[PDB]
Each structure stands twice: as structure tokens, then as C-alpha cells.
Design a protein around this ligand. Structure first.
Ligand code: FMN
Ligand code: VGN
Ligand code: DDQ
Ligand code: ORO
Length: 365
């Protein structure tokens, strides 16, 4: 029917009652890849346009990594209304991830816990999948609909930095921006790459490889961090980011914390928690990183965004763009248009000429 209320109150609840989360996810990717979606309707206004990372974004709402892990539904996602698409978290070689079940719903908390473990088709498969639509994407990007590629590492890799280096060389030429994901809570020792010494070495290699690509194929490089960092960790990341000239940060992957108050029966499953319970922890992390980097480093805010208010709070905290995933798993496609519509209304209501004017607003009051 293509209606917010119908999807949230009937279609989605029914779907989740018939299919486990991973099955619903696979089914969703299929329908999305085929463009079988409800009306978009919402028309992006000039107010939502953002210029950052060397690109124009029709609107600041993107689909976070993890929904389209292998780059199979990019075009369908733009059709859904996202201002930008970030694909997967691709590992050099293909790998299956953890055994099932590996993802769980916490309906009473509007949250999800996942421990997929980097299931990925691998760089080669994704490379050819993106090459098949490389020129179509070039036009989309020019039209204000950029593509991001999230890089991960193989479970059995003996050289983490080389895994990311490979990703930069293979998919960097096909992306507007690359994401060095060192914040997955489901890969042993991965988060330790967020440490100062280890991060500096890793990012120096990544940036060298990126700089070695032809200008037209030279993507911006961002680092995606966890919401569970100590104050010391954040200070160190900010320092390395400014020292190396990292282009941006994606703030907050899922959390390994289990906030008091979770009601879901599956709250104690191992994995990263996403959704509403993560929202403010992520917003506060965005706020801190913005201040530590003097507002000079673009931030993509993500974690628990399901409304215009959620989006604006992250923008005012310092995010230039935001992403969502879990909200889509509960409310369906209509949630994209809802967030954009509510965000536009709030911007006007609060006297902002547009999204750009609101970025980091809280720090100036
Ligand atoms: C099932 C699932 C799979 C995910 N896979 C990835 C991934 O491969 N790479 C990554 O950087 N983040 C991944 N994420 C994290 C999301 O990109 C995002 O940082 C986090 O879920 C917070 O946003 P949300 O509350 O809107 O879901 C995943 C999240 C979920 C729920
Ligand atoms: C862990 C995870 O990714 N879960 C999920 C991921 C996606 C979805 C989904 C998203 C979009 C539709 C859709 C698409 C086209 C037309 C109409 C509806 C359907 C299902 C549901 C879940 C879920 O847990 O239930
Ligand atoms: C992904 C399973 C959820 C089932 C709903 C599929 C909705 C079809 C939307 C109809 N349409 C393409 C015409 O807009
Ligand atoms: O593949 C996964 O398990 C995964 C990766 C990541 O970066 N974040 C997450 O929540 N899950």
C-alpha cells in the first residue's frame, strides 16, 4: 500500500511473525534489488542537500552498512529514498560468517542483536557486481546519490592491514568513499585496531594505497568506530585522524554493552546491539568526536535513527550525514520518507535554512 501506518502496524509485524530476521533480511534484499517497493512520493527539497566528502548528497539519510553486504540492491535502495548507499563490509576472500541463528530481534526494545561475523561474497564478486553498473553509478553520484564501500577483514587473515589494503585497491576505484571498519564486535581482535599505534600504522598504509589510485578513482577514506570506546581511545583516534588527514568518521557501529532496561527475551545473546537502545550512546559519541576534531572532520552519524528528531539530534551533535538500518527492519521502506519529511519540518521549525546550517549547532549554543 506504500503507507507508513500500514507497514508499521500490519505488514511488518505479520512478516516478522512468519520469518526469522535473517530470512526476512534475505527476502528484503531480493525485493529491493528488483525495485519492488512502495511509492517513494516524498520529494527531496533543496533544504536536505549536503555537500561533503567531495560530493553532493541529495538528502542526508543513507542506508548503513550491513543491509546490502554484497552490493546486490544499490539501485533499489536509491529508489527507496536513501540519499546515499553504503554497501556491505566486504572481506578480501569469501567467507560464510557464523552459524545460524546469528541475528535476533528484541521487539520490545525496537532493537536487534547480530553476530553474523562478516559473511561476505568477497572482493572479486563485489568488484564485478559493481563494475556491471559502474557508469550508472557515476551518473547517480553526479546527480547527488553517492556510493560508499565498507571494508572488513577475513577471519583467518594473518595481516589485517594488508586485508584493508587489498580492499582499497580493488573496490576503491568503484567507490565515492571507503570505510575502514575496525569496530565490528564480531571479529576477534578487530576492535583492537582502534588503538593509537595500531590505527596509525593501519591508516597510513590505507591512505598510501588510496593516494596511489587515479584521480577519478580516488575515494575519500573514513574510519568507522565503536560506541564502546574509552575517553582515551577517542582522544587517540581524534589525534591520528588529524595527524594523517583522514577524510571522515562514521560514528558508532553496534554496541557490546547491554543497557539496563532491555526487555527482549534475547537481550543476553552475544553480538552487537543496534536500534533505539543504541541511539543516545551513539549521539554522545558523535558529539565527543566532533569536539575532539574541532568540527573539521565530517561525521556520518548512525545508531538508532528512526525519526526526523533522531536524525536532527545527531546532525546538531556534529553529523553532516546520518544512516539507519534497524529502523528499516521494524518499520519497512516507508520509514525513509518519514525521517526525511520529519527532518525537513524540524529544520524549518528550528529556524535552520537547511541541513548544512544545523551541523554541529549544539556546540555553538
Ligand atoms: C544485521 C546487522 C548487520 C550489520 N553489518 C555491518 C557490517 O557488515 N559492517 C558495518 O560497518 N556495520 C554493520 N552493521 C552496523 C550498522 O551499519 C550500524 O552501524 C548500526 O546497526 C547502528 O545503526 P542502526 O541502529 O540504525 O541499525 C550491522 C548491523 C546490523 C543490525
Ligand atoms: C537483521 C535484519 O536485517 N532484519 C530485517 C531486514 C529487512 C527487513 C525488511 C525490509 C524491507 C522490506 C520491504 C521491501 C520492499 C517492499 C516492502 C517491504 C521487508 C523486510 C525486515 C527485517 C526483520 O527483522 O524483520
Ligand atoms: C518483502 C516482502 C514484503 C511484501 C511486500 C511486498 C510489497 C510489494 C509492494 C508493491 N509495489 C511494488 C507495487 O509497490
Ligand atoms: O558482520 C557482522 O557481524 C557485523 C559487522 C559489523 O561491523 N557490525 C555488526 O554489528 N555486525
Amino acid at each position: 500500500t506504500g503507507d507508513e501506518r500500514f507497514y508499521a502496524e500490519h505488514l511488518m509485524p505479520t512478516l516478522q511473525g512468519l520469518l526469522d530476521p535473517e530470512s526476512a533480511h534475505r527476502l528484503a534484499v531480493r525485493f529491493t534489488s528488483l525495485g519492488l517497493l512502495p511509492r517513494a512520493r516524498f520529494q527531496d527539497s533543496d533544504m536536505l542537500e549536503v555537500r561533503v566528502l567531495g560530493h553532493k548528497f541529495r538528502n542526508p539519510v543513507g542506508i548503513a552498512a550491513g543491509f546490502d553486504k554484497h552490493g546486490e540492491a544499490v539501485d533499489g535502495l536509491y529508489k527507496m529514498g536513501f540519499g546515499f548507499v553504503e554497501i556491505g563490509s566486504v572481506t578480501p576472500k569469501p567467507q560464510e560468517g557464523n552459524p545460524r541463528p546469528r541475528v535476533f530481534r528484541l521487539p520490545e526494545d525496537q532493537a536487534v542483536i547480530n553476530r553474523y561475523g562478516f559473511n561476505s561474497h568477497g572482493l572479486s564478486v563485489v568488484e564485478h557486481r559493481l563494475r556491471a553498473r559502474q557508469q550508472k553509478q557515476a551518473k547517480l553520484t553526479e546527480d547527488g546519490l553517492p556510493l560508499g564501500v565498507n571494508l572488513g577483514k577475513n577471519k583467518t587473515s594473518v595481516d589485517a592491514a594488508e586485508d584493508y589494503a587489498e580492499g582499497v585497491r580493488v573496490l576503491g576505484p568503484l567507490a565515492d568513499y571507503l570505510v575502514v571498519n575496525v569496530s565490528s564486535p564480531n571479529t576477534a581482535g578487530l576492535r583492537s585496531l582502534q588503538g593509537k599505534a595500531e590505527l596509525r600504522r593501519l591508516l597510513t598504509k590505507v591512505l598510501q594505497e588510496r593516494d596511489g589510485l587515479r584521480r577519478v578513482h580516488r575515494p575519500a577514506v573514513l574510519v568507522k568506530i565503536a560506541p564502546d570506546l574509552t575517553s582515551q581511545d577517542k582522544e587517540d583516534i581524534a589525534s591520528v585522524v588529524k595527524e594523517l588527514g583522514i577524510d571522515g568518521l562514521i560514528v558508532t557501529n553496534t554496541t557490546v554493552s547491554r543497557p539496563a532496561g532491555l526487555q527482549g527475551a534475547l537481550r543476553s545473546e552475544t553480538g552487537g546491539l543496534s536500534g533505539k537502545p543504541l541511539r543516545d550512546l551513539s549521539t554522545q559519541t558523535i558529539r565527543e568526536m566532533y569536539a575532539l576534531t574541532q568540527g573539521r572532520v565530517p561525521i556520518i552519524g548512525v545508531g538508532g535513527v528512526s525519526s526526523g528528531q533522531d536524525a536532527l539530534e545527531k546532525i546538531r551533535a556534529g553529523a553532516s550525514l546520518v544512516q539507519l538500518y534497524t529502523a528499516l527492519t521494524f518499520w519497512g521502506p516507508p520509514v525513509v520518507g518519514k525521517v526525511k519529511r520529519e527532518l525537513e519540518a524540524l529544520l524549518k521549525e528550528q529556524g535552520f535554512g537547511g541541513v548544512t546550517d544545523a551541523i554541529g549547532a549544539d556546540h555553538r549554543r
